Design a protein around this ligand. Structure first.
Ligand SMILES: O=C(O)c1ccccc1Nc1cccc(C(F)(F)F)c1
Ligand SMILES: O=C(O)c1ccccc1Nc1cccc(C(F)(F)F)c1
Lengths: 338, 278, 217, 233, 60
């Protein structure tokens, strides 16, 4: 009689797949076959921030689009002023093993996590004039793969324990615990409204969790391997996922399908970072092939290459205003393109 | 006059060898700039040395040519002093960039535990510039005395008074050479001590270091012989040019048998030549 | 034209840069190692004079006459996590520790070595094999035949030949022969010599890296 | 708690030498530049000297150049001002002012209780011609300041600082860069203006708004303060 | 056993299946409209003049 319950799981999976198939009246490529291609996106290395001594693993543009934080394996979280390249801050981390970093939208706080399994939140606005860890969120049983700020008080984090956690910084306890992922969670992205967040895991699946409910609204299974990076569309009704299978995939929440796929026969490496331009027409994917590819969101056609790195592009980010892109690689350099 | 004719062929052979070696080094290290291939610090120093030595070799060859085709103008105060000044200003840099390469190799490869040595090793990329500055000070001093000597000779187009200038240019070349040797008899000493430490925990490398040892021995012997002969003639100018053009052409081959990029490029060039021939 | 505030910001930036570079030197004379092996292979007491300093990553520091080694022990079965691994790519050399007197589990150790020796990230780091429990192997070789846990088996089935056979079996899984080097040392647990072996291997690897950077080979 | 204590001030003959000390406690003094600003017995503030973080850069006022020497001992968290050949014009209260310079910073945010030093008997002019401003609680006021040279730099920052000195209290930063409200300042204060004309507006004047408001330019050294607009009941 | 865990998974699948799904054509049209409406406000897709470019190369 135990298999009678799994019969329900099979029936629900069949219903979901049938609904997805019946809802695909056309394809994005076919619909976008009568638009002007972007052409060639020839960006240039406007700035080259050279402060780190090890492999930079994460970065996050500030809300002002001028200040950016970057975490390195050398135990340093450096806050840079992109316009002038001056290091506005250089916080020494307790644990050198850092794999994520985040800049608060208000800019008053910064976050960093890693193999320590604890998210350290530092306050950049202190009357003492020095950046000190304001909070040490703990409870995750695995390494922190990503974390993003919703406000000065709440923070969403994803760990290697196959689960995510929404923490209230003041209390220091997990307000919400998102569970359901079968593999380690590698990246998360917050929606523009900061109400639903999309998380990718090693189980080749992406889940659109609800911040105010703690439930997986939808699950997307289109990738063939680990989902390393994820980013929402600027509209907020769609997102993109980069995977180790050398293929990016653009899904839509309302359709709950794989709207488009980006892949090339000459690209066999894994995607390390994914980001969207201000208008969402350009999807910048930082690969392990030492290069970044600017794919056309609506056409799946490569539009340019930001080849300036001697090692893999671990992290990629786009300014809020869309003025410039920032790519941080394992070569310990962070280059701002425009 | 066996020497009077043999030295001509020797000089031509040295000129050809220097051109080939230094130009090959420069082209190998410059094709990376266009093709985008990365070049290390040693590549940059080798390129600087190669473009300096293709200048020194060409200068000495032009000095010989002017002494054969139209020697009437060669024996002129303006000529003599300008040729000498442009020879020393280039030779000093060409030898001190070879000593900067030696300092680079010694500071990186060697594994001494001295505190000062470690401090210099962590600044290996900056010592090869402070060294160049202090050596520019040496260059100013040298210009000083190889100019005072020329003025004294002219007041007394050299009136067979070039022994002093040839002797003074040979100490400011030996100081770089002595420093380079002292930094090569500590690098090899460290390598041998480390290898002895590896009792139980590639003949090509041994033969390559033996090549450097042989080249240094030969150059030191020849330079000392030249210096003692000068201190103790009509043909004495051709031999001086031969020596002056020896080091730039000779050491380039040793460098080619060093940096593996250059050796691989040379082997590939030989392969291409063999394929084209057949 | 740079404003006074901008100039002061540049001064602060250079002060932070000099902080970073001073700490860079201070760390630069410290070598990071990676320690692997089976649970009972002897990971805990490989050096025997250490001082242990979240999940896994049991860092342990020691020194030998000029260096501060920091071995980052990685939890069991974590050698192929694919996520912590790329973090430990700056490791100067790996310190894999095997167990000679573990025939039944020997294959597992071998497999683990094959995982780390041929790993994409750990393709150039020079393993340092530590065939531990040599004392127990001495009696076991003369008591238990090695052919029990080896197809080719040992011809003479003696302490020396069998030990060499096991060492070679560990070494044979080094397809990239010309890219990396593997050092072997048959410790006996009660040996105050493993630190010297690690220091010698690290010095050799550092000299080799410096020679490669200089382009000599 | 941020604290700057001044000491070493007293009576010195016209020609003697003195060493004013400023002890800093409660913040990373090593990472903070320090200014010396003197207020005459009845005149406004005047920037005397400045030392940058790490002692890399040092600036002196034109009237004290060659006579005043500014130094700092970071391990001791101390700042020293050595004055030699002290003229009668040096009689004033000296304040050591904290200042950190980085994007989004608040230079001159905190001041220290000044020490009295009594002596026995190409600059951006800033005009503040509103010394007298009678007002009462519950009203709104607008102090005005002017500059000979525009303080709007090409980078987009207008380097104008509005400070307030209450009766018996050291100056406190109210507005920095003409638009940003300093930490701890009530929101009623608002700095505005453009080009060479700037204004500080107080909507509802509370009992803590009585005192002298000063306008200073930080575009380029030497730093010049305003005459000082006195709001009294 | 862990039958209850499978039941929880079944419940999650039941909740996910019953959702409002729009046609893929509508989503594609919405994405195209969003891209075309904010195209002018995309400094990367359409490079802005160097005067308005904050990251413009320093004069040499
Ligand atoms: O004077 C040298 O022997 C000489 C020395 C170094 C480089 C070139 C040289 N040839 C040279 C240059 C100028 C004048 C004369 C000479 F006076 F011998 F004719 C020779
Ligand atoms: O040839 C010099 O100028 C040199 C001097 C000092 C130290 C090393 C030098 N060069 C060098 C050139 C080839 C091979 C090696 C060695 F392998 F011995 F290190 C060293």
């Amino acid at each position: 009689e135990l298999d009678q319950l799994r019969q329900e799981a099979e029936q629900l999976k069949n219903q979901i797949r049938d609904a997805r198939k019946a809802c695909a009246d056309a394809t994005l490529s076919q619909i976008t076959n009568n638009i002007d291609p972007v052409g060639r996106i020839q960006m240039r290395t406007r700035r080259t921030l050279r402060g780190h001594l090890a492999k930079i693993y994460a970065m996050h543009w500030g809300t002002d689009s001028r200040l950016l934080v970057s975490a390195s394996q050398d135990g340093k979280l450096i806050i840079w002023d992109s316009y002038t390249t001056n290091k506005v801050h250089a916080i020494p981390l307790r644990s050198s093993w850092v794999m994520t970093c985040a800049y608060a939208p208000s800019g008053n706080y910064v976050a960093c996590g890693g193999l320590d399994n604890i998210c350290s939140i530092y306050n950049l606005k202190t009357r003492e004039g020095n950046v000190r860890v304001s909070r040490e969120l703990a409870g995750h049983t695995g390494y922190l793969s990503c974390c993003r700020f919703l406000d000065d008080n709440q923070i969403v984090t994803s760990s290697g324990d196959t689960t995510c956690a929404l923490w209230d910084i003041e209390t220091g306890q997990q307000t919400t615990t998102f569970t359901g992922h079968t593999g380690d969670v590698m990246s998360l992205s917050l929606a523009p409204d900061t109400r639903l967040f999309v998380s990718g895991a090693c189980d080749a699946s992406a889940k659109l969790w609800d911040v105010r409910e703690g439930m997986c609204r939808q699950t997307f299974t289109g990738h063939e391997s680990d989902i390393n990076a994820i980013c929402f569309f600027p509209n907020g009704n769609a997102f993109a996922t980069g995977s180790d299978d050398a293929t990016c995939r653009l899904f839509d929440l309302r359709a709950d399908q794989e709207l488009m796929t980006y892949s090339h026969d000459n690209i066999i490496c894994g995607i390390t970072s994914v980001s969207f331009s201000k208008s969402g027409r350009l999807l910048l994917a930082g690969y392990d092939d030492f290069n970044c590819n600017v794919w056309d969101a609506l056409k799946a056609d490569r539009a340019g290459v930001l080849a300036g790195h001697d090692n893999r592009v671990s992290c990629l980010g786009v300014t809020d205003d869309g003025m410039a892109v920032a790519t941080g690689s394992w070569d310990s350099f962070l280059k701002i393109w425009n | 006059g066996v020497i009077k004719s043999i030295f001509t062929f020797v000089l031509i052979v040295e000129f050809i060898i220097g051109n080939l070696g230094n130009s090959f080094i420069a082209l190998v290290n410059c094709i990376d700039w266009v093709k985008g291939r990365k070049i290390s610090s040693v590549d940059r120093i080798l390129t600087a040395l190669a473009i300096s030595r293709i200048s020194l070799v060409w200068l000495i060859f032009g000095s010989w040519c002017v002494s054969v085709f139209f020697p009437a103008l060669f024996a002129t105060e303006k000529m003599f002093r300008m040729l000498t000044n442009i020879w020393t200003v280039i030779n000093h840099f060409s030898v001190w960039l070879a000593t900067g390469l030696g300092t680079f190799y010694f500071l990186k490869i060697a594994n001494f535990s001295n505190s000062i040595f470690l401090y210099l090793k962590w600044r290996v990329k900056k010592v090869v510039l402070v060294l160049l500055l202090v050596t520019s000070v040496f260059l100013f001093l040298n210009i000083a005395l190889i100019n005072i000597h020329i003025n004294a000779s002219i007041n007394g187009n050299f009136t067979r008074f070039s022994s002093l200038i040839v002797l003074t240019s040979t100490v400011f070349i030996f100081i770089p050479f002595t420093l380079s040797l002292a930094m090569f008899l500590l690098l090899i000493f460290s390598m041998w001590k480390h290898r002895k430490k590896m009792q139980h925990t590639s003949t090509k490398a041994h033969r390559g270091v033996k090549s450097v040892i042989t080249f240094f021995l030969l150059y030191a012997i020849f330079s000392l012989s030249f210096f003692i002969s000068v201190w103790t003639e009509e043909n004495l100018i051709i031999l001086s040019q031969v020596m002056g053009m020896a080091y730039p052409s000779c050491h380039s081959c040793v460098l080619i048998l060093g940096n593996k990029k250059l050796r691989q490029a040379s082997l590939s060039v030989l392969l291409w030549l063999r394929y084209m021939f057949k | 034209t740079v404003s006074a505030e901008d100039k002061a910001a540049a001064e602060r930036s250079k002060e932070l840069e000099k902080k970073l570079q001073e700490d860079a030197e201070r760390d630069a004379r410290t070598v990071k190692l990676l320690l692997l092996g089976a649970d009972n292979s002897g990971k805990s007491t490989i050096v025997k004079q250490m001082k242990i300093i979240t999940t896994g990553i049991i860092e342990t520091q020691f020194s030998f006459k000029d260096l501060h080694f920091r071995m980052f022990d990685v939890g069991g079965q974590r050698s192929e996590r694919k996520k912590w691994i790329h973090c430990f790519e700056d490791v100067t050399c790996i310190i894999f520790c095997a167990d000679l007197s573990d025939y039944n589990r020997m294959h597992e150790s071998l497999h683990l070595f094959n995982s780390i020796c041929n790993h994409k990230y750990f393709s150039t780091t020079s393993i340092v094999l530590f065939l531990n429990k040599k004392d127990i192997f001495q009696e076991k070789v003369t008591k238990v035949h090695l052919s029990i846990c080896f197809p080719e088996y040992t011809g003479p089935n003696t302490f020396e030949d069998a030990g060499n056979y096991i060492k070679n079996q560990f070494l044979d899984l080094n397809l990239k022969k010309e890219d990396k080097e593997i050092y072997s040392h048959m410790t006996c647990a009660t040996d105050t010599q493993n630190a010297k072996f690690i220091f010698d291997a690290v010095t050799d690897i550092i000299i080799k890296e410096n020679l490669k950077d200089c382009g000599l080979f | 708690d941020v604290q700057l204590v001044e000491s070493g001030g007293g009576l010195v003959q016209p020609g003697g030498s003195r060493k004013l000390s400023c002890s800093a406690s409660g913040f990373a003094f090593s990472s903070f530049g320090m200014h010396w600003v003197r207020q005459a017995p009845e005149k406004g503030l005047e920037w005397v000297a400045y030392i940058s973080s790490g002692s890399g850069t040092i600036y002196y006022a034109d009237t004290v150049k060659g006579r005043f020497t500014i130094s700092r001992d970071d391990p001791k968290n101390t700042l020293f001002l050595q004055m030699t050949s002290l003229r009668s014009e040096d009689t004033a209260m000296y304040y050591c002012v904290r200042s950190i310079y980085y994007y989004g910073s608040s230079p001159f945010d905190f001041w220290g209780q000044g020490t009295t030093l009594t002596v026995s008997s190409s600059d951006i002019v800033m005009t503040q011609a509103t010394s007298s401003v009678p007002v009462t609680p519950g009203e709104s006021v607008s102090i005005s300041c002017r500059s000979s040279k525009s303080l709007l730099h090409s980078n987009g920052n207008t380097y104008l600082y509005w400070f307030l000195q209450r009766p018996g209290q050291s100056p406190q930063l109210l507005i920095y860069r003409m638009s940003n409200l300093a930490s701890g300042v009530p929101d009623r204060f608002s700095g505005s203006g453009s080009g060479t004309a700037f204004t500080l507006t107080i909507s509802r004047l509370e009992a803590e708004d009585v005192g002298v408001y000063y306008c200073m330019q930080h575009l380029e050294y030497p730093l010049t303060f305003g005459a000082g607009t006195k709001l009294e009941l | 056993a862990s039958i209850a865990q499978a039941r929880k998974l079944v419940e999650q699948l039941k909740m996910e299946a019953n959702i409002d799904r729009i046609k893929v054509s509508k989503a594609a049209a919405d994405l195209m409209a969003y891209c075309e409406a904010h195209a002018k406000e995309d400094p990367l897709l359409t490079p802005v003049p160097a005067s308005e470019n904050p990251f413009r190369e320093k004069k040499f």
